Design goal:
This is part of a larger assembly, with three copies of chain A, one copy of chain B (128 residues), one copy of chain C (54 residues), one copy of chain D (57 residues) and one copy of chain E (122 residues). By secondary structure, chain A is mainly alpha-helical. In chain A, α2 runs antiparallel to α4. Classes of the chains: A mainly alpha (73), B alpha+beta (128), C mainly alpha (54), D alpha+beta (57), E mainly alpha (122).
């Protein structure tokens, strides 16, 4: 039976969402606390937050494609 | 290299030292050779400066602001800096007993000034 | 030791001491009074030095 | 301490700690030291060339 | 109450997505922070996708409050079989927290709608 | 049928290591964003350690992903 | 045996889960030594001796756990 083990591959693979969810808040906590020290507002800290969040979110997008491929192919 | 200059006399003045341990606001910090920049407030403790070997001079500072420059320079600006041998044990007990009885006995700034004088007298009497 | 001249010395406030160029180079406690304590201590020191020279 | 809630700044806190440490030391070593903690100066705020009440603590 | 809460929350989520799409027909769109990079359209998990997650989280307050009150049936059989006065203090604290959760859930729903109205006009 | 069933579950248990790779990319960026506001680590200097430090932390996620992808 | 061979492969994977404590332990002592050396002045001594001795104690957990998975 291959259909029974295919459903378990989409549940245990979602355990990696803890690092992607906490990583978006870790980069936002340092940017909000650093901007109040004057005066990283326009660009500088604001431009690095958009590029820094894409690196932390890359692990969640790659792990989600593995569980989604087992439920379709 | 220390610059412990008071507002009445000069102690270190010229740069001819090695290590110095002064009580700051957080903990008992100690400057070594090329110290990092740290401008923390000094509390009422003992400011000992080790002169190469064991020729340290314990100077009981009354509190100030220990400034550490980036060029391995320590500027300990304090109001009063006296040695440990210049204090009397009989006269120190009279100031601590009068400040404890005057605390929480009136109003205005009389009770608030007695709490700060009792804490500074207890730290100097325990380091004899 | 015979003549003198009238000089002047500026004193910064608490808002100008924290807005310096290299003010963040030293480890200063931002939770306690660090910006206000630097301007209050400098006012009494500058007044004592000007009164002694005068 | 809690000196930020009252009207005591860094100049008043440093003068109170230096005067209490000098009086708690040796009584015989108080030569040329009592004049640094006692003053007879007064302060009077002016307005417009009139002034108010003169205070000296 | 559980089926009516999920149906009422789904209607509020569709109105927030339809109002933001109607304002984009005459005030440009964009809605994306640019910082010399790309791949901004792949992370479209907000605005439209955020309305589905916010409606299920706000609508679950009615089901979570009913689960706390229905849990007293298991503790009633053990207290009528240490002293049983500990169950009265625990049920009073859970009832006060469930009633106060309605005010926090209503304030969280109004704060989420303020971000969609301010971003649609900027 | 037992060999084909274990291959599908192997792609999910091997993805548990993404928590260290996802949080590691944000831990290096949090210290660089807070340290750049102290003036003045902008061009180069701290930019080289942040780019080299992020590649070393991302090596664990790329090596762990090849195991689940080889099934 | 089929049951004895299946438990040996599962034992080598469950015993390898302890690498998170040994891997983060070597980095915890290195993070305090890098930040502590910048505050002057223990570099080649004092803090250098505690870092070498502290890393050997944290690495003992990874070496003991690796022998269990290797013998199963």
């Amino acid at each position: 039976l291959v259909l029974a083990a295919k459903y378990i591959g989409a549940a245990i693979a979602t355990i990696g969402l803890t690092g992607a969810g906490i990583g978006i808040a870790i980069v936002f906590a340092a940017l909000i606390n650093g901007t109040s020290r004057n005066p990283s507002l326009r660009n500088t800290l604001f431009p690095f937050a958009i590029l820094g969040f894409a690196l932390s979110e890359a692990t969640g997008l790659f792990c989600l494609m593995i569980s989604f491929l087992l439920l379709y192919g | 290299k220390v610059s412990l200059v008071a507002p009445h006399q000069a102690i270190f003045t010229n740069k001819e030292v090695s290590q110095v341990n002064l009580p700051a606001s957080s903990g008992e910090m100690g400057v070594l050779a090329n110290h990092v920049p740290t401008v923390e407030e000094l509390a009422p403790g003992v400011v000992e400066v080790i002169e190469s070997s064991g020729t340290a001079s314990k100077y009981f500072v009354s509190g100030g602001f220990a400034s550490i420059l980036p060029g391995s320079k320590l500027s300990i600006s304090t109001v009063e800096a006296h040695p440990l041998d210049a204090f009397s044990s009989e006269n120190i007990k009279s100031l601590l007993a009068e400040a404890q009885k005057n605390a929480s006995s009136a109003d205005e700034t009389v009770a608030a000034e007695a709490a700060i004088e009792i804490e500074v007298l207890e730290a100097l009497q325990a380091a004899v | 030791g015979v003549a003198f001249e009238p000089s002047v010395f500026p004193s910064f406030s608490p808002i100008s001491i924290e807005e310096s160029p290299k003010l963040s180079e030293f480890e200063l406690e931002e939770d306690q009074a660090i910006p206000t304590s630097l301007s209050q201590i400098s006012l009494t020191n500058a007044i004592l030095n000007a009164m002694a020279e005068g | 301490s809690s000196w930020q809630k009252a009207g005591i700044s860094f100049n008043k806190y440093l003068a109170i700690a230096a005067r209490t440490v000098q009086r708690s030391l040796k009584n015989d070593l108080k030569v040329a030291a009592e004049k640094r903690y006692i003053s007879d100066a007064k302060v009077q705020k002016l307005e417009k060339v009139s002034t108010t009440d003169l205070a000296s603590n | 109450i559980y089926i009516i809460g999920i149906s009422v929350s789904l209607w509020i989520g569709l109105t927030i997505l339809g109002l933001f799409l109607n304002k984009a027909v005459f005030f440009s769109l964009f809605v994306p922070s640019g910082t010399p990079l790309p791949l901004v359209p792949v992370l479209v998990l907000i605005e439209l996708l955020s309305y589905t997650a916010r409606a299920i989280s706000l609508g679950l307050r009615l089901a979570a409050n009913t689960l706390s009150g229905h849990l007293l049936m298991s503790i009633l059989g053990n207290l009528v079989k240490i002293f049983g006065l500990i169950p009265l203090a625990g049920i009073f604290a859970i009832v006060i927290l469930e009633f106060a959760i309605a005010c926090i859930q209503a304030y969280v729903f109004a704060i989420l709608t303020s971000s969609y109205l301010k971003d649609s006009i900027y």
